[PDB]
Give the backbone structure.
Amino acid sequence: GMLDNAIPQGFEDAVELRRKNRETVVKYMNTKGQDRLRRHELFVEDGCGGLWTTDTGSPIVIRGKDKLAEHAVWSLKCFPDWEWYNIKVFETDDPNHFWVECDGHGKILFPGYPEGYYENHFLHSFELDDGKIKRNREFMNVFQQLRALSIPVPQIKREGIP
Amino acid sequence: GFEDAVELRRKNRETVVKYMNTKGQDRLRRHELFVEDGCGGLWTTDTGSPIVIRGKDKLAEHAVWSLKCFPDWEWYNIKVFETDDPNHFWVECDGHGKILFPGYPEGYYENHFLHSFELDDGKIKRNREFMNVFQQLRALSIPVPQIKREGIPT
């Protein structure tokens, strides 16, 4: 609240590692367009990433820099103009773990589905090792993607909810 | 001073932990952790508009509905993240229990959650839940669409 205006933000441990790690997270979140083809360079060699909120229940994980590089090509194909916005970066008490809350939007071109426009809200988890990403996990609202793919959305009635 | 950040963060963390540990009939009093103007609800919904439960009164009344529809609900595998803001926390966890929604067969519901908490001097201003909506469809015996991601490298 208003009496907290002068309370210092951030953490006093591992400050150089925190700065380094944060710089990488920010760099990742700011990566758009053609720079997406080199985003894998922010990762450790056996780093991984992917989608943690899926239709199967299991994460869809892309493993290792080579596969991350290949995935960037698929990503630029299916989300050609994708951009994150309303980005908020959270440091945590772990200097190697960050969370990012944001929105993201762009054209969606998945083969077998009609072209759409895709809008979603995201939480991103980043785990790092000395300035490089070990793992990035995306969490989003799966019905926003169904919409953008023109897949009918199942509706849940919550009868009696206040 | 950082000592003020530290005490605030510690007090807030205790309230977040108390919330996450609240189960059974204590769910009826979980609203006591909030400011009067406190809010809660679900930010990953079928409409894309959050289900917002505003005010301590409405939070108390929602708890009754919650205990009816999710009678044995427990959070587990709870991972609490402090942030650079002493008043903001994230919690990653799992959650599970029976689901009893009118109009659907009784089911078993498991899901993976992110919780956002914003606090003021040890009291919760806002909780926001984020989860995998498909898991709730599965629990309610609603068929889940399969999204084909042709050519995805993994």
Chain B touches chain A through 59 residues (CB under 8 Å). The longest strand of chain B covers residues 107-120. The two ends of chain B are 47 Å apart (CA to CA). Residues 4-144 of chain B form a domain with the Nuclear Transport Factor 2; Chain: A, fold (CATH 3.10.450.50).
